[PDB]
Amino acid sequence: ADMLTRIRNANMVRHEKLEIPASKLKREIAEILKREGFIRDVEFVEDSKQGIIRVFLKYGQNNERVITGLKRISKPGLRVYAKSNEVPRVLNGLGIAIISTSQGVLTDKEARAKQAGGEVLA
Amino acid sequence: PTINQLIRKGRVSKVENSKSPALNKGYNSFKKEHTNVSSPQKRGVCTRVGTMTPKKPNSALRKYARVRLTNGIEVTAYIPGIGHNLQEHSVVLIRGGRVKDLPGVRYHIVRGALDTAGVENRAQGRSKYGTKKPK
RNA sequence: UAAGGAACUCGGCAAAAUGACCCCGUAACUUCGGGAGAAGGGGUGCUCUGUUAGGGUGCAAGCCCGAGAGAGCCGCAGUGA
RNA sequence: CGCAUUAGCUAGUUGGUGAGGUAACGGCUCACCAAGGCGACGAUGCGUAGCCGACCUGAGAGGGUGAUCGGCCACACUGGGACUGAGACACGGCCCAGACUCCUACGGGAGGCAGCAGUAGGGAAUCUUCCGCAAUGGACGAAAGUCUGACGGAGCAACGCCGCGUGAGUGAUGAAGGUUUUCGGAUCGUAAAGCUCUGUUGUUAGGGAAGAACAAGUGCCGUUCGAAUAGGGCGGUACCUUGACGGUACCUAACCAGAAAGCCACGGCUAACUACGUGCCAGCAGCCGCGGUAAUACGUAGGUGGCAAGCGUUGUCCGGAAUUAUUGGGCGUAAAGGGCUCGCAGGCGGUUUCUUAAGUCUGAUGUGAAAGCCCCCGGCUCAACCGGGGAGGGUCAUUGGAAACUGGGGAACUUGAGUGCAGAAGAGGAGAGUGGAAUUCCACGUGUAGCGGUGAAAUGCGUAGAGAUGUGGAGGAACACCAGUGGCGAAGGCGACUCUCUGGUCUGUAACUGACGCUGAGGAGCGAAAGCGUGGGGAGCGAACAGGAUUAGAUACCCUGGUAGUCCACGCCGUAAACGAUGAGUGCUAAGUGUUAGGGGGUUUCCGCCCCUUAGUGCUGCAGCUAACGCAUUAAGCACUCCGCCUGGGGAGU
RNA sequence: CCGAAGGUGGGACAGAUGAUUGGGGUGAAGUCGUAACAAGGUAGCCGUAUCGGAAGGUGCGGCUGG
RNA sequence: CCUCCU
Ligand SMILES: [Mg+2]
Ligand SMILES: [Mg+2]
Ligand SMILES: [Mg+2]
Ligand SMILES: [Mg+2]
Ligand SMILES: [Mg+2]
Ligand SMILES: [Mg+2]
Ligand SMILES: [Mg+2]
Ligand SMILES: [Mg+2]
Ligand SMILES: [Mg+2]
Ligand SMILES: [Mg+2]
Ligand SMILES: [Mg+2]
Ligand SMILES: [Mg+2]
Ligand SMILES: [Mg+2]
Ligand SMILES: [Mg+2]
Ligand SMILES: [Mg+2]
Ligand SMILES: [Mg+2]
Ligand SMILES: [Mg+2]
Ligand SMILES: [Mg+2]
Ligand SMILES: [Mg+2]
Ligand SMILES: [Mg+2]
Ligand SMILES: [Mg+2]
């Protein structure tokens, strides 16, 4: 359940789109990523598997991406739980961390406000 | 190593060894035990005075003492200084420096614990050879 | 048989010592069986509690076997030879 | 805290019931019952250690230390016990025992410097047998006061840290004076030469501290008690009194900047050179390295940047050292993938939904002394220093939320993983039997002088007829051709044929199951060759061994022989460059081309061609990776899980 | 009754020391050969066995890091 | 076959 490597690998070879097995949180990550401007639309099909639809992330609609050099790292099975106070910022801004909360995500202000740091990405 | 592996078996630091082990052991007459005490010098008695050839690429007759310390450990130690400071079987104080040439000589005899000379009329820092400054 | 205790003698030869039962405990070494009763220690009579607990025999009465305890008693010494 | 090269420990042990004891709960003690308790989350044992505030270091994570100063603990010559009490099971008590000191006219007594000083001894090394309770704090007492080596002071010691200095300032002979020499010099050097201005301090005499609050003694007044005006005490209120340091700090004022500069370093790291004397000597050295007759690193002699009465040397700790790597490293060839499986524990685990709320997050409240370091930081002239308000401080309570994620329960799902069904290939394994070729030996026929061997020879075998040739017999071992970066197997491995028994893999189909999965320390198993045990077998080959050569020698290579062994059964051993020098699983990330076993689909009657596709097996090559070589969908790429392993070379796989 | 010290006993563990002995390290110019590095003059190396003054040799199997 | 030390 690592979309990040799927993205990195396709992003490296400047692929137009990629089909990632869908899960609720992998759906909710792709939309966080889409907040910038990736994904145009997907095709929900008759469900046989729970993810056959995939995420269909299409960050390279044109020849070259305006949003290129996508990079992620902080995804270990050893759980890394952030304090609302001590949520990090990727590159001191210019990068986001998908901090899984009971009710919120994203910036440093969206930590002391929202609360549960939980997961931490880059 | 995996995190699980690091938990199961931690990291292990390198054991650093002292360059002067003989000055690290004290002694007790009563218990007849070495004690762990960080000494800067040790008094001893010279069991043998002579000369030894250095290793390549050097040649010399390097004057030294086999010395028996207060802690009961027998060391070899270099008699430093130009001119005959070699001395004979007698009490002496020792120091912690190796003679790179002489293999086994890990200690210097301190000049000034008794009758000494070393290098007389030293240019600067006139305190390394027991050179009493004349007036 | 005083004191001593192998000084005896080729040589502890001879003698002395040890010795039963129950209990504790037991090394090197080993062919893993042993070594082993290793070694070294402790208990041991009699009386009462008491025809004790318990067991054998028997319908019972009774007869027989019988720990382990507790409390005593006596002697220099209780597997008192 | 360390050690598994410490794995079992415990028997009042674990719980019960009762009794007793204790300030007190309690195997705390005992009686009587059971059979527990502890331990791979490390029991038990051994080693080491007082713990903490802090301290040193570091960007921090961390690491080290726990002298001085504050708190908790423990101990008081060694060991045992109680007494007295609110309280020791006693630091200058006792009782008893022990080893030491003292006294004893010998019967018996006395004491414990880990209190201050001091001594001896040990050691590299650590003070005065000092003065005073004036101050602060004790104990006692109503108070005066006494006692106080607590404490305040002073002595000693450059052992630290630091003072504010040891002046400021005017002034170019660049004199004097130095060691060099291209016989000339040049820099110190406005600093001094000649001064001429101020007193941080002190060179000698006069003033003189603060520290002292007082406690009381006394005199008075409101309050509460008071038979009461007694007579005291307690709130405001007078008056009174005392200093070890010490005639010491500090001031004035002369003699007057006089008394107050130092040590170390100068290849490079790191800003800083020449004579002479040595001649691998003498000596030097943190590292690299200097010296053998022209030494910018040695002996001497003259010459210069830091910090400032010291700085050199040795010792210890942290840093540098992303050099044990959590932050923050590795394992194809540098050190490093376990020889390979099966797997217990453990670690890790697809998607949806519901519920839970241990983890996770979050609000609020309590503490985390004082000192120290630090945020604002103030005061004492700033300081080498003292006060307040904060902050940090917790994997910490308690409680109320949130619920995505991790975990738990319930319900689903089919993509993982299995099952069923239908095909496929295979030297996968075990057992029994069987075949042909060749070698060897034996017998026999024919035949006759060599054969064999080498670089060249010789030993061998041959006229007791070898070698060659023909025929037959005996026996053992290995399987030409097929045969191929072909196949199968977890690895080691597996190659004649046949049968018997038996394991796995691949493809297709999705009927069924519905995370049933991955990895896997220890454990168990398998594991080339050699080796070992017992019993067989023994053709060929062939360690050893012998002989012949070769050679200086030849315990080798070459030749001729030849034992174990190689083979079989059973058992053991457990290792190999057991290699892809590349752990397993999963996903993802250009192409091109062979080949092995399948599948589907083209027009076609097939064959055949072409397209697609699964799983192997090769080659080339993108991106990316790499110290480079190279790797590259069979990754050494990009990721996640789990295991194994590495930490300079030797010593030593000892 | 409990009970310190003491006594006796057999074990456990740790250090020191010991005739002698074993390899190891180190040491300007010792002796013997020449094993390795080139096809190192018999490719080398790994495991194992055996033999030999010594490096080493030889067998069997393995590897290419020939 | 070997080729002293710095
Ligand atoms: Mg007699
Ligand atoms: Mg007698
Ligand atoms: Mg006799
Ligand atoms: Mg006699
Ligand atoms: Mg007899
Ligand atoms: Mg201690
Ligand atoms: Mg470090
Ligand atoms: Mg190598
Ligand atoms: Mg290697
Ligand atoms: Mg392997
Ligand atoms: Mg292991
Ligand atoms: Mg074999
Ligand atoms: Mg055999
Ligand atoms: Mg041969
Ligand atoms: Mg191995
Ligand atoms: Mg192999
Ligand atoms: Mg290996
Ligand atoms: Mg496995
Ligand atoms: Mg050679
Ligand atoms: Mg060779
Ligand atoms: Mg041989």
PDB file of C-alpha atoms (C1' of nucleotides) in Angstrom, chain D residues 46 79-81 96-98 280-281 292 493 528-532 541-545 552-557 564-565 575-581 649-652 654, chain E residues 3-6 13-14 23-26 28-29 32-35 41-42 44-66:
ATOM      1  C1'   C D  46      29.564 -13.165  38.928  1.00  0.00           C
ATOM      2  C1'   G D  79      30.880  -8.463  64.144  1.00  0.00           C
ATOM      3  C1'   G D  80      26.251  -9.591  67.309  1.00  0.00           C
ATOM      4  C1'   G D  81      22.341  -7.804  70.825  1.00  0.00           C
ATOM      5  C1'   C D  96      29.250  -9.474  74.588  1.00  0.00           C
ATOM      6  C1'   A D  97      32.948 -11.537  70.995  1.00  0.00           C
ATOM      7  C1'   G D  98      37.526 -10.451  67.759  1.00  0.00           C
ATOM      8  C1'   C D 280      72.891   7.234  10.972  1.00  0.00           C
ATOM      9  C1'   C D 281      77.161   9.598  15.847  1.00  0.00           C
ATOM     10  C1'   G D 292      75.861   8.728   6.834  1.00  0.00           C
ATOM     11  C1'   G D 493      23.059 -32.005  -6.494  1.00  0.00           C
ATOM     12  C1'   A D 528      29.986 -31.576  -2.608  1.00  0.00           C
ATOM     13  C1'   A D 529      34.680 -33.860  -1.675  1.00  0.00           C
ATOM     14  C1'   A D 530      37.804 -35.651   1.737  1.00  0.00           C
ATOM     15  C1'   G D 531      37.611 -38.300   6.437  1.00  0.00           C
ATOM     16  C1'   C D 532      35.731 -41.972  10.320  1.00  0.00           C
ATOM     17  C1'   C D 541      42.009 -44.560 -11.230  1.00  0.00           C
ATOM     18  C1'   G D 542      45.258 -43.568  -7.317  1.00  0.00           C
ATOM     19  C1'   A D 543      46.989 -39.871  -1.393  1.00  0.00           C
ATOM     20  C1'   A D 544      50.913 -42.700   0.994  1.00  0.00           C
ATOM     21  C1'   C D 545      54.934 -45.807  -0.223  1.00  0.00           C
ATOM     22  C1'   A D 552      73.295 -28.252  -6.935  1.00  0.00           C
ATOM     23  C1'   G D 553      69.660 -30.856  -4.058  1.00  0.00           C
ATOM     24  C1'   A D 554      64.408 -32.779  -5.817  1.00  0.00           C
ATOM     25  C1'   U D 555      61.512 -35.871   0.419  1.00  0.00           C
ATOM     26  C1'   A D 556      58.355 -32.262  -6.530  1.00  0.00           C
ATOM     27  C1'   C D 557      56.747 -31.634 -11.440  1.00  0.00           C
ATOM     28  C1'   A D 564      44.186 -46.518   1.710  1.00  0.00           C
ATOM     29  C1'   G D 565      40.410 -44.390  -0.871  1.00  0.00           C
ATOM     30  C1'   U D 575      32.760 -28.486   6.064  1.00  0.00           C
ATOM     31  C1'   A D 576      34.004 -26.031   0.529  1.00  0.00           C
ATOM     32  C1'   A D 577      35.914 -19.939  -3.877  1.00  0.00           C
ATOM     33  C1'   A D 578      28.872 -24.891  -0.305  1.00  0.00           C
ATOM     34  C1'   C D 579      29.863 -18.551  -5.593  1.00  0.00           C
ATOM     35  C1'   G D 580      25.711 -15.047  -8.765  1.00  0.00           C
ATOM     36  C1'   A D 581      31.657 -14.030  -3.753  1.00  0.00           C
ATOM     37  C1'   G D 649      45.785  -4.557   9.624  1.00  0.00           C
ATOM     38  C1'   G D 650      48.277  -8.227  12.489  1.00  0.00           C
ATOM     39  C1'   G D 651      47.835 -11.311  16.988  1.00  0.00           C
ATOM     40  C1'   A D 652      43.504 -15.147  15.415  1.00  0.00           C
ATOM     41  C1'   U D 654      44.279 -18.564  17.995  1.00  0.00           C
TER      42        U D 654
ATOM     43  C1'   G E   3      22.151 -16.693  68.539  1.00  0.00           C
ATOM     44  C1'   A E   4      27.972 -13.452  66.792  1.00  0.00           C
ATOM     45  C1'   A E   5      32.717 -15.156  66.895  1.00  0.00           C
ATOM     46  C1'   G E   6      35.300 -19.658  66.900  1.00  0.00           C
ATOM     47  C1'   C E  13      35.361 -19.424  42.544  1.00  0.00           C
ATOM     48  C1'   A E  14      39.368 -15.690  41.844  1.00  0.00           C
ATOM     49  C1'   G E  23      53.200 -21.055  19.615  1.00  0.00           C
ATOM     50  C1'   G E  24      52.894 -15.262  18.935  1.00  0.00           C
ATOM     51  C1'   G E  25      54.937 -10.215  18.279  1.00  0.00           C
ATOM     52  C1'   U E  26      59.107  -7.283  17.499  1.00  0.00           C
ATOM     53  C1'   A E  28      69.620  -1.827   9.375  1.00  0.00           C
ATOM     54  C1'   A E  29      72.565  -5.378   6.778  1.00  0.00           C
ATOM     55  C1'   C E  32      68.467 -22.764   3.841  1.00  0.00           C
ATOM     56  C1'   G E  33      65.870 -22.991  -0.206  1.00  0.00           C
ATOM     57  C1'   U E  34      62.368 -20.064  -3.964  1.00  0.00           C
ATOM     58  C1'   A E  35      56.232 -21.208  -2.386  1.00  0.00           C
ATOM     59  C1'   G E  41      58.379 -21.069 -15.252  1.00  0.00           C
ATOM     60  C1'   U E  42      53.688 -27.604 -12.504  1.00  0.00           C
ATOM     61  C1'   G E  44      46.311 -20.002  -8.465  1.00  0.00           C
ATOM     62  C1'   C E  45      42.969 -20.340  -4.602  1.00  0.00           C
ATOM     63  C1'   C E  46      38.898 -23.096  -1.165  1.00  0.00           C
ATOM     64  C1'   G E  47      37.544 -27.572   1.793  1.00  0.00           C
ATOM     65  C1'   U E  48      39.782 -32.255   3.261  1.00  0.00           C
ATOM     66  C1'   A E  49      43.399 -36.123   3.624  1.00  0.00           C
ATOM     67  C1'   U E  50      48.277 -37.594   3.709  1.00  0.00           C
ATOM     68  C1'   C E  51      53.489 -36.875   3.281  1.00  0.00           C
ATOM     69  C1'   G E  52      57.897 -33.751   3.616  1.00  0.00           C
ATOM     70  C1'   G E  53      63.924 -29.404   6.810  1.00  0.00           C
ATOM     71  C1'   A E  54      61.164 -25.304   5.311  1.00  0.00           C
ATOM     72  C1'   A E  55      58.379 -22.778   2.332  1.00  0.00           C
ATOM     73  C1'   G E  56      55.292 -26.673   0.382  1.00  0.00           C
ATOM     74  C1'   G E  57      54.023 -31.582  -2.516  1.00  0.00           C
ATOM     75  C1'   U E  58      50.383 -35.101  -3.892  1.00  0.00           C
ATOM     76  C1'   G E  59      45.201 -37.245  -4.009  1.00  0.00           C
ATOM     77  C1'   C E  60      39.695 -36.172  -4.252  1.00  0.00           C
ATOM     78  C1'   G E  61      35.890 -32.526  -5.015  1.00  0.00           C
ATOM     79  C1'   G E  62      35.070 -27.335  -5.909  1.00  0.00           C
ATOM     80  C1'   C E  63      35.863 -22.038  -7.752  1.00  0.00           C
ATOM     81  C1'   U E  64      37.737 -18.349 -11.743  1.00  0.00           C
ATOM     82  C1'   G E  65      39.195 -14.050  -8.160  1.00  0.00           C
ATOM     83  C1'   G E  66      43.328 -18.357 -14.797  1.00  0.00           C
TER      84        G E  66
END
